[PDB]
Write a protein that binds this ligand. Structure first.
Ligand SMILES: [K+]
Ligand SMILES: [K+]
Ligand SMILES: [Mg+2]
Ligand SMILES: [Mg+2]
Ligand SMILES: [Mg+2]
Ligand SMILES: [Mg+2]
Ligand SMILES: [Mg+2]
Ligand SMILES: [Mg+2]
Ligand SMILES: [Mg+2]
Ligand SMILES: [Mg+2]
Ligand SMILES: [Mg+2]
Ligand SMILES: [Mg+2]
Ligand SMILES: [Mg+2]
Ligand SMILES: [Mg+2]
Ligand SMILES: [Mg+2]
Ligand SMILES: [Mg+2]
Ligand SMILES: [Mg+2]
Ligand SMILES: [Mg+2]
Ligand SMILES: [Mg+2]
Ligand SMILES: [Mg+2]
Ligand SMILES: [Mg+2]
Ligand SMILES: [Mg+2]
Ligand SMILES: [Mg+2]
Ligand SMILES: [Mg+2]
Ligand SMILES: [Mg+2]
Ligand SMILES: [Mg+2]
Ligand SMILES: [Mg+2]
Ligand SMILES: [Mg+2]
Ligand SMILES: [Mg+2]
Ligand SMILES: [Mg+2]
Ligand SMILES: [Mg+2]
Ligand SMILES: [Mg+2]
Ligand SMILES: [Mg+2]
Ligand SMILES: [Mg+2]
Ligand SMILES: [Mg+2]
Ligand SMILES: [Mg+2]
Ligand SMILES: [Mg+2]
Ligand SMILES: [Mg+2]
Ligand SMILES: [Mg+2]
Ligand SMILES: [Mg+2]
Ligand SMILES: [Mg+2]
Ligand SMILES: [Mg+2]
Ligand SMILES: [Mg+2]
Ligand SMILES: [Mg+2]
Ligand SMILES: [Mg+2]
Ligand SMILES: [Mg+2]
Ligand SMILES: [Mg+2]
Ligand SMILES: [Mg+2]
Ligand SMILES: [Mg+2]
Ligand SMILES: [Mg+2]
Ligand SMILES: [Mg+2]
Ligand SMILES: [Mg+2]
Ligand SMILES: [Mg+2]
Ligand SMILES: [Mg+2]
Ligand SMILES: [Mg+2]
Ligand SMILES: [Mg+2]
Ligand SMILES: [Mg+2]
Ligand SMILES: [Mg+2]
Ligand SMILES: [Mg+2]
Ligand SMILES: [Mg+2]
Ligand SMILES: [Mg+2]
Ligand SMILES: [Mg+2]
Ligand SMILES: [Mg+2]
Ligand SMILES: [Mg+2]
Ligand SMILES: [Mg+2]
Ligand SMILES: [Mg+2]
Ligand SMILES: [Mg+2]
Ligand SMILES: [Mg+2]
Ligand SMILES: [Mg+2]
Ligand SMILES: [Mg+2]
Ligand SMILES: [Mg+2]
Ligand SMILES: [Mg+2]
Ligand SMILES: [Mg+2]
Ligand SMILES: [Mg+2]
Ligand SMILES: [Mg+2]
Ligand SMILES: [Mg+2]
Ligand SMILES: [Mg+2]
Ligand SMILES: [Mg+2]
Ligand SMILES: [Mg+2]
Ligand SMILES: [Mg+2]
Ligand SMILES: [Mg+2]
Ligand SMILES: [Mg+2]
Ligand SMILES: [Mg+2]
Ligand SMILES: [Mg+2]
Ligand SMILES: [Mg+2]
Ligand SMILES: [Mg+2]
Ligand SMILES: [Mg+2]
Ligand SMILES: [Mg+2]
Ligand SMILES: [Mg+2]
Ligand SMILES: [Mg+2]
Ligand SMILES: [Mg+2]
Ligand SMILES: [Mg+2]
Ligand SMILES: [Mg+2]
Ligand SMILES: [Mg+2]
Ligand SMILES: [Mg+2]
Ligand SMILES: [Mg+2]
Ligand SMILES: [Mg+2]
Ligand SMILES: [Mg+2]
Ligand SMILES: [Mg+2]
Ligand SMILES: [Mg+2]
Ligand SMILES: [Mg+2]
Ligand SMILES: [Mg+2]
Ligand SMILES: [Mg+2]
Ligand SMILES: [Mg+2]
Ligand SMILES: [Mg+2]
Ligand SMILES: [Mg+2]
Ligand SMILES: [Mg+2]
Ligand SMILES: [Mg+2]
Ligand SMILES: [Mg+2]
Ligand SMILES: [Mg+2]
Ligand SMILES: [Mg+2]
Ligand SMILES: [Mg+2]
Ligand SMILES: [Mg+2]
Ligand SMILES: [Mg+2]
Ligand SMILES: [Mg+2]
Ligand SMILES: [Mg+2]
Ligand SMILES: [Mg+2]
Ligand SMILES: [Mg+2]
Ligand SMILES: [Mg+2]
Ligand SMILES: [Mg+2]
Ligand SMILES: [Mg+2]
Ligand SMILES: [Mg+2]
Ligand SMILES: [Mg+2]
Ligand SMILES: [Mg+2]
Ligand SMILES: [Mg+2]
Ligand SMILES: [Mg+2]
Ligand SMILES: [Mg+2]
Ligand SMILES: [Mg+2]
Ligand SMILES: [Mg+2]
Ligand SMILES: [Mg+2]
Ligand SMILES: [Mg+2]
Ligand SMILES: [Mg+2]
Ligand SMILES: [Mg+2]
Ligand SMILES: [Mg+2]
Ligand SMILES: [Mg+2]
Ligand SMILES: [Mg+2]
Ligand SMILES: [Mg+2]
Ligand SMILES: [Mg+2]
Ligand SMILES: [Mg+2]
Ligand SMILES: [Mg+2]
Ligand SMILES: [Mg+2]
Ligand SMILES: [Mg+2]
Ligand SMILES: [Mg+2]
Ligand SMILES: [Mg+2]
Ligand SMILES: [Mg+2]
Ligand SMILES: [Mg+2]
Ligand SMILES: [Mg+2]
Ligand SMILES: [Mg+2]
Ligand SMILES: [Mg+2]
Ligand SMILES: [Mg+2]
Ligand SMILES: [Mg+2]
Ligand SMILES: [Mg+2]
Ligand SMILES: [Mg+2]
Ligand SMILES: [Mg+2]
Ligand SMILES: [Mg+2]
Ligand SMILES: [Mg+2]
Ligand SMILES: [Mg+2]
Ligand SMILES: [Mg+2]
Ligand SMILES: [Mg+2]
Ligand SMILES: [Mg+2]
Ligand SMILES: [Mg+2]
Ligand SMILES: [Mg+2]
Ligand SMILES: [Mg+2]
Ligand SMILES: [Mg+2]
Ligand SMILES: [Mg+2]
Ligand SMILES: [Mg+2]
Ligand SMILES: [Mg+2]
Ligand SMILES: [Mg+2]
Ligand SMILES: [Mg+2]
Ligand SMILES: [Mg+2]
Ligand SMILES: [Mg+2]
Ligand SMILES: [Mg+2]
Ligand SMILES: [Mg+2]
Ligand SMILES: [Mg+2]
Ligand SMILES: [Mg+2]
Ligand SMILES: [Mg+2]
Ligand SMILES: [Mg+2]
Ligand SMILES: [Mg+2]
Ligand SMILES: [Mg+2]
Ligand SMILES: [Mg+2]
Ligand SMILES: [Mg+2]
Ligand SMILES: [Mg+2]
Ligand SMILES: [Mg+2]
Ligand SMILES: [Mg+2]
Ligand SMILES: [Mg+2]
Ligand SMILES: [Mg+2]
Ligand SMILES: [Mg+2]
Ligand SMILES: [Mg+2]
Ligand SMILES: [Mg+2]
Ligand SMILES: [Mg+2]
Ligand SMILES: [Mg+2]
Ligand SMILES: [Mg+2]
Ligand SMILES: [Mg+2]
Ligand SMILES: [Mg+2]
Ligand SMILES: [Mg+2]
Ligand SMILES: [Mg+2]
Ligand SMILES: [Mg+2]
Ligand SMILES: [Mg+2]
Ligand SMILES: [Mg+2]
Ligand SMILES: [Mg+2]
Ligand SMILES: [Mg+2]
Ligand SMILES: [Mg+2]
Ligand SMILES: [Mg+2]
Ligand SMILES: [Mg+2]
Ligand SMILES: [Mg+2]
Ligand SMILES: [Mg+2]
Ligand SMILES: [Mg+2]
Ligand SMILES: [Mg+2]
Ligand SMILES: [Mg+2]
Ligand SMILES: [Mg+2]
Ligand SMILES: [Mg+2]
Ligand SMILES: [Mg+2]
Ligand SMILES: [Mg+2]
Ligand SMILES: [Mg+2]
Ligand SMILES: [Mg+2]
Ligand SMILES: [Mg+2]
Ligand SMILES: [Mg+2]
Ligand SMILES: [Mg+2]
Ligand SMILES: [Mg+2]
Ligand SMILES: [Mg+2]
Ligand SMILES: [Mg+2]
Ligand SMILES: [Mg+2]
Ligand SMILES: [Mg+2]
Ligand SMILES: [Mg+2]
Ligand SMILES: [Mg+2]
Ligand SMILES: [Mg+2]
Ligand SMILES: [Mg+2]
Ligand SMILES: [Mg+2]
Ligand SMILES: [Mg+2]
Ligand SMILES: [Mg+2]
Ligand SMILES: [Mg+2]
Ligand SMILES: [Mg+2]
Ligand SMILES: [Mg+2]
Ligand SMILES: [Mg+2]
Ligand SMILES: [Mg+2]
Ligand SMILES: [Mg+2]
Lengths: 92, 271, 45
RNA sequence: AGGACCGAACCGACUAAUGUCGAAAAAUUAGCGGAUGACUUGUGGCUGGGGGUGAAAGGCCAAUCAAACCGGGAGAUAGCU
RNA sequence: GCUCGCCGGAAGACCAAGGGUUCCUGUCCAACGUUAAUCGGGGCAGGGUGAGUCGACCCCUAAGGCGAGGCCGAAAGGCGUAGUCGAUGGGAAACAGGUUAAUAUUCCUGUACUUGGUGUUACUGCGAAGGGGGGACGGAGAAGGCUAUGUUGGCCGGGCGACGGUUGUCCCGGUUUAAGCGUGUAGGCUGGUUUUCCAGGCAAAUCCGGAAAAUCAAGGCUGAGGCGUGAUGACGAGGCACUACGGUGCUGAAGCAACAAAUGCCCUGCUUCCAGGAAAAGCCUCUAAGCAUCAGGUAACAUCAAAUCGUACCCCAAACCGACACAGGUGGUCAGGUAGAGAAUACCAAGGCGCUUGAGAGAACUCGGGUGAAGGAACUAGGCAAAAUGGUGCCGUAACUUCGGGAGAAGGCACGCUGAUAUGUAGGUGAGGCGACUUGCUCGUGGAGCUGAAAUCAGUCGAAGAUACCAGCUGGCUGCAACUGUUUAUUAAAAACACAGCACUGUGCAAACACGAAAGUGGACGUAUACGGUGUGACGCCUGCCCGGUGCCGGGAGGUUAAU
């Protein structure tokens, strides 16, 4: 089911307080996914690469902040995060 | 019928209503009415071509049958209805086989009366016939100018054509204008007079009553400035100009008839 | 006390947008001008 | 029932004072007119320059209107300063 | 932190539009902030937007846009058919409480629900580009039942009071609970079948329509709310355990009744009127072309599936539109208390703020106010401006009138508090109780509380009782315009425009006329009781004479007369 491409979906694990509090208490992992990357694709990718039982994936698009420095305006890239909830068989 | 209204408010002082008690007090028959959007006078190019029209009450089109073909089938008049699209009232005719259709309500017609249409039939008010079968010197309405068409002449409240003569293939008709027009004998005409003749005695009574009939205010040329209308300007109520339209053509006695394709059919012009 | 610019992004795009300009012979020439001049914002979009 | 009455919202703009390098390129304050109607307002459409639209004032058409705005003819022409 | 102040139909709380990170945290004070700044919507980093149900998307369409062929146009292009787009409208489903420094109908917990796909069983006559039904529609009005909500008891937990009194009718605070799934009610709408049948619904149809003949006193439909249950659940005044002084896990009392009550809801109802009130899919239904151990439907079940984009924040504002952190402008929603007719006004609750230069002084003069001797419009172009009047009930009210008006004409008088009539009444809502009908969310029947005017009679305080805020000045003669309305955005609101009504006049429908090289639209899916133009301007009494001039209409002999 969508071999080779699944590898390109997950970019990195996200590091924050809200990310951390959702590790132990909610049993989820927050992670930066590709701008495409549907909830099925993120789930199927976590199911293979991280190899854990996924309950459900929630997803959102974060808007890049307009950082004006020196004398030029420049906006960051829009990146998509995914809160991935895990089943009781969990680890990382 | 013509009831004058009591003067409890100014603009309710001069009101004179045409109350018809025999009309219907309920919603109309849905299958024979489609929607009818308003132009506001404007056309394809979105430009006011006819002035003084705009607004008024939203009003749906009744699919009224003027041609009145469906032959040899007697039809009972179920109920007389209001038509907002029209001067004359309409009648919901139930054909014996189980159609319903709207027709213009003639003078002597009521909820219960039976009507037939076609070639044979009987000579009675409501019954459509070819004008060849109709007697000379008889009052008709809803008259066709061409055989097979709907019905052009005499459809306004109280209106009727009288058949003057019959020269072979042609029938000479005396119209309500006074014009004596020659039409084809194969053309059809519904017998009698068009109902709601009290319509003319209605008097509105307020500016508002014209607005909710979809009319907008007419501004007089004399009021305007030279740039707008030929009558225009002057330092306090001047004129000194021969009456004219906003486009310079003379009004007030000036024949604009110039068809020339139908001049053969007109026997005597109106007067 | 109510000024002239009363914004609406639908109206904006329907009136002045890229497809609104592309639609017409003269609207295509506007774009041809802005390209010829070399503008960054070709339309409002 | 009513282009009925009184009166808030809402729509307006009759009087006065203030303000006039303003708080504001038209407002504030205190009064004032309409307030179920020819009412009012949101959203979207249509009508284009000698053209539109106008319950008509030459009013309105992006703070611009007895002919909009932008680019072009164009360095119009000026017996004038 | 504690006082003080101001808003509270907002200066509160949610949204749309529009902004576009302003949100939140740490940090910094050059500039930006009309002052300072440790602060900030400022600089600099880092966080923060979680959806099958909310919105968009999608499904249908309105005005309207585009528009294969097409028709038309020097070219450009115009119009328009089939179509296809186009919301501001129609179309499946989620609620309570808990949680983050910042999202929550999205996370969590607890209960639900919808539409699809896909397998098994038991049945069985299914299927559109078609038919029919439905969706599905106006203004006003009036009532009845409800609820949101509020008030007061009841119960529960505290409280006995900085200066006189306060264990009592005393004081404070709480008294909350959803969608769903049941029950089908207050009510609203209707005839319900059975078989036959027929030129209609362009074909077909058992459906719709029409016509029959019988058959029983009604059977459906719709429907707020209440009761249920969800809920031994959550929440809950507080405590207990503890403090980075933040709290946090644990426990967690009562958790009822009455009465009042919407502009909400029943109600897309009902009566009622004339100006006569979208469309199309979803949805149910019916069959043609088709297809017959097929394919489809149907239920009951199991299982998957519900993608994508928006979700922070401000939003009558310092974040939008106004060049400004601008005394402006900006759509919807929510609507607590006392007084009140009230969304007016006053004071307040929840919640929110004190308007980003202060500090002194207390001149003239200016601005916004208050009071004013005697006088009282003498002011001035003009009573401009201020002063006045102002509520409710009852009495009383002129000319003139179109018989409605004028009219709130004018002018009067009565109002507070406290007892009594009645230890709070006319009423209002009416509990347990008594019988009875069928089977109930019953009827009468009685009234327990509860709520509650308005009078009258007597007392009684003040200068004054509509005591504040709130809230008509009145009358007389008269010009113009009948009237409500409209108008010079920003020096003119008027006697100007419009207006109903009136007349003239054109127009026989391929109408006149209008926009347009044209095609074509509008007029009008109208047809002379209609339409366009022009003048006049309700209504009443009237509207006199002139056709030489100019126009127009008709007439056609003669004269004159182009192209050819
Ligand atoms: K030149
Ligand atoms: K306080
Ligand atoms: Mg989830
Ligand atoms: Mg999402
Ligand atoms: Mg970038
Ligand atoms: Mg067009
Ligand atoms: Mg059109
Ligand atoms: Mg056009
Ligand atoms: Mg007209
Ligand atoms: Mg209009
Ligand atoms: Mg019509
Ligand atoms: Mg009409
Ligand atoms: Mg008509
Ligand atoms: Mg022949
Ligand atoms: Mg006219
Ligand atoms: Mg007129
Ligand atoms: Mg005129
Ligand atoms: Mg003028
Ligand atoms: Mg013009
Ligand atoms: Mg002229
Ligand atoms: Mg003049
Ligand atoms: Mg004169
Ligand atoms: Mg003269
Ligand atoms: Mg002339
Ligand atoms: Mg001329
Ligand atoms: Mg002329
Ligand atoms: Mg004549
Ligand atoms: Mg536009
Ligand atoms: Mg060119
Ligand atoms: Mg350019
Ligand atoms: Mg741009
Ligand atoms: Mg009315
Ligand atoms: Mg009124
Ligand atoms: Mg009055
Ligand atoms: Mg008044
Ligand atoms: Mg407003
Ligand atoms: Mg004003
Ligand atoms: Mg104004
Ligand atoms: Mg004055
Ligand atoms: Mg003043
Ligand atoms: Mg000055
Ligand atoms: Mg100043
Ligand atoms: Mg004011
Ligand atoms: Mg006043
Ligand atoms: Mg007033
Ligand atoms: Mg008035
Ligand atoms: Mg407006
Ligand atoms: Mg608009
Ligand atoms: Mg347009
Ligand atoms: Mg021009
Ligand atoms: Mg030009
Ligand atoms: Mg032109
Ligand atoms: Mg023109
Ligand atoms: Mg106007
Ligand atoms: Mg002038
Ligand atoms: Mg202007
Ligand atoms: Mg001007
Ligand atoms: Mg010019
Ligand atoms: Mg010019
Ligand atoms: Mg312009
Ligand atoms: Mg040159
Ligand atoms: Mg020059
Ligand atoms: Mg206040
Ligand atoms: Mg209040
Ligand atoms: Mg909201
Ligand atoms: Mg901005
Ligand atoms: Mg953005
Ligand atoms: Mg920033
Ligand atoms: Mg902040
Ligand atoms: Mg610092
Ligand atoms: Mg410093
Ligand atoms: Mg620096
Ligand atoms: Mg500073
Ligand atoms: Mg400054
Ligand atoms: Mg900070
Ligand atoms: Mg900041
Ligand atoms: Mg979704
Ligand atoms: Mg909902
Ligand atoms: Mg949209
Ligand atoms: Mg999709
Ligand atoms: Mg579809
Ligand atoms: Mg569509
Ligand atoms: Mg259309
Ligand atoms: Mg279309
Ligand atoms: Mg087109
Ligand atoms: Mg082809
Ligand atoms: Mg072709
Ligand atoms: Mg073509
Ligand atoms: Mg043709
Ligand atoms: Mg075109
Ligand atoms: Mg079409
Ligand atoms: Mg919408
Ligand atoms: Mg829906
Ligand atoms: Mg919707
Ligand atoms: Mg829903
Ligand atoms: Mg909640
Ligand atoms: Mg909980
Ligand atoms: Mg808890
Ligand atoms: Mg927040
Ligand atoms: Mg759950
Ligand atoms: Mg469970
Ligand atoms: Mg359960
Ligand atoms: Mg269940
Ligand atoms: Mg449901
Ligand atoms: Mg289901
Ligand atoms: Mg259908
Ligand atoms: Mg609707
Ligand atoms: Mg209605
Ligand atoms: Mg009324
Ligand atoms: Mg009544
Ligand atoms: Mg009621
Ligand atoms: Mg309740
Ligand atoms: Mg509640
Ligand atoms: Mg109590
Ligand atoms: Mg104690
Ligand atoms: Mg004490
Ligand atoms: Mg003591
Ligand atoms: Mg004691
Ligand atoms: Mg208490
Ligand atoms: Mg209490
Ligand atoms: Mg239910
Ligand atoms: Mg169920
Ligand atoms: Mg149900
Ligand atoms: Mg039942
Ligand atoms: Mg048939
Ligand atoms: Mg049948
Ligand atoms: Mg039933
Ligand atoms: Mg049912
Ligand atoms: Mg229920
Ligand atoms: Mg109840
Ligand atoms: Mg209960
Ligand atoms: Mg309940
Ligand atoms: Mg229970
Ligand atoms: Mg239980
Ligand atoms: Mg608990
Ligand atoms: Mg605390
Ligand atoms: Mg009650
Ligand atoms: Mg209330
Ligand atoms: Mg209905
Ligand atoms: Mg269904
Ligand atoms: Mg079925
Ligand atoms: Mg799953
Ligand atoms: Mg799923
Ligand atoms: Mg939010
Ligand atoms: Mg806020
Ligand atoms: Mg705020
Ligand atoms: Mg707000
Ligand atoms: Mg404001
Ligand atoms: Mg606010
Ligand atoms: Mg400005
Ligand atoms: Mg600004
Ligand atoms: Mg400020
Ligand atoms: Mg502001
Ligand atoms: Mg304001
Ligand atoms: Mg009072
Ligand atoms: Mg207030
Ligand atoms: Mg300040
Ligand atoms: Mg001083
Ligand atoms: Mg002073
Ligand atoms: Mg003053
Ligand atoms: Mg002073
Ligand atoms: Mg005073
Ligand atoms: Mg004074
Ligand atoms: Mg004095
Ligand atoms: Mg004194
Ligand atoms: Mg005195
Ligand atoms: Mg005096
Ligand atoms: Mg004097
Ligand atoms: Mg003097
Ligand atoms: Mg004088
Ligand atoms: Mg004077
Ligand atoms: Mg005076
Ligand atoms: Mg005055
Ligand atoms: Mg004074
Ligand atoms: Mg005084
Ligand atoms: Mg005063
Ligand atoms: Mg006085
Ligand atoms: Mg006084
Ligand atoms: Mg007084
Ligand atoms: Mg009085
Ligand atoms: Mg008198
Ligand atoms: Mg008089
Ligand atoms: Mg009085
Ligand atoms: Mg009276
Ligand atoms: Mg007194
Ligand atoms: Mg008393
Ligand atoms: Mg008693
Ligand atoms: Mg006693
Ligand atoms: Mg007593
Ligand atoms: Mg009592
Ligand atoms: Mg008493
Ligand atoms: Mg009692
Ligand atoms: Mg008693
Ligand atoms: Mg009694
Ligand atoms: Mg009683
Ligand atoms: Mg009752
Ligand atoms: Mg009962
Ligand atoms: Mg008793
Ligand atoms: Mg009393
Ligand atoms: Mg006494
Ligand atoms: Mg006394
Ligand atoms: Mg006394
Ligand atoms: Mg008073
Ligand atoms: Mg007044
Ligand atoms: Mg008088
Ligand atoms: Mg005079
Ligand atoms: Mg007037
Ligand atoms: Mg007059
Ligand atoms: Mg206007
Ligand atoms: Mg206006
Ligand atoms: Mg105005
Ligand atoms: Mg002005
Ligand atoms: Mg304007
Ligand atoms: Mg101007
Ligand atoms: Mg003015
Ligand atoms: Mg003025
Ligand atoms: Mg005025
Ligand atoms: Mg005047
Ligand atoms: Mg006028
Ligand atoms: Mg006459
Ligand atoms: Mg006449
Ligand atoms: Mg032409
Ligand atoms: Mg033509
Ligand atoms: Mg039409
Ligand atoms: Mg006049
Ligand atoms: Mg007389
Ligand atoms: Mg005369
Ligand atoms: Mg003559
Ligand atoms: Mg003569
Ligand atoms: Mg002449
Ligand atoms: Mg002539
Ligand atoms: Mg002649
Ligand atoms: Mg001749
Ligand atoms: Mg001759
Ligand atoms: Mg000759
Ligand atoms: Mg010759």
């Amino acid at each position: 089911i969508r071999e080779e491409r699944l590898l390109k979906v997950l970019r990195a694990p996200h590091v924050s307080e809200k990310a951390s509090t959702a590790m132990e208490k909610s049993n989820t992992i927050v992670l930066k996914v590709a701008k495409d990357a549907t909830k099925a694709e993120i789930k199927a990718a976590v199911q293979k690469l991280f190899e854990v039982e996924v309950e459900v994936v929630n997803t959102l698009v974060v808007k890049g902040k307009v950082k004006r420095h020196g004398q030029r305006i420049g906006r960051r890239s829009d990146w998509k995060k995914a809160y991935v909830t895990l089943k009781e068989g969990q680890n990382l | 019928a013509v009831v004058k209204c009591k003067p409890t408010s100014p603009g309710r002082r001069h009101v004179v209503k045409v109350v018809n008690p025999e009309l219907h007090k309920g919603k109309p028959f849905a299958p024979l009415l489609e929607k009818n959007s308003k132009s506001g006078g404007r056309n394809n190019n979105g430009r006011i071509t006819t002035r003084h029209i705009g607004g008024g009450h939203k009003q749906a089109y009744r699919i009224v049958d003027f041609k009145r073909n469906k032959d040899g089938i007697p039809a009972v008049v179920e109920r007389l209805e209001y038509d907002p699209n029209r001067s004359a009232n309409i009648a919901l005719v139930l054909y014996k086989d189980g159609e319903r259709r709207y027709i213009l309500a003639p003078k002597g017609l009521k909820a219960g009366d039976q009507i037939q249409s076609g070639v044979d039939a009987a000579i009675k008010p409501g019954n459509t016939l070819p004008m060849r079968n109709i007697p000379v010197g008889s009052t008709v309405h809803n008259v066709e100018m061409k055989p097979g068409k709907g019905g052009q002449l005499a459809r306004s409240a109280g209106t009727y054509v009288q058949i003057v003569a019959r020269d072979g293939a042609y029938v000479t008709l005396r119209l309500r204008s006074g014009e004596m027009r020659k039409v084809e004998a194969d053309c059809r005409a519904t017998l009698g007079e068009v109902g709601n003749a009290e319509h003319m005695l209605r008097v509105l009574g307020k500016a508002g009553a014209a607005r909710w009939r979809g009319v907008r205010p007419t501004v007089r040329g004399t009021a305007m400035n030279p740039v707008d209308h030929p009558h225009g300007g002057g330092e306090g109520r001047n004129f000194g100009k021969h009456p004219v339209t906003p486009w310079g053509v003379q009004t007030k006695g000036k024949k604009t008839r110039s068809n020339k394709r139908t001049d053969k059919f007109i026997v005597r012009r109106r007067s | 006390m109510k000024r002239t610019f009363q914004p609406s992004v639908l109206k904006r795009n329907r009136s002045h947008g890229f497809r609104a300009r592309m639609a017409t012979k003269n609207g295509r020439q506007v774009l041809a001008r802005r390209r010829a001049k070399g503008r960054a914002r070709l339309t409002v979009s």
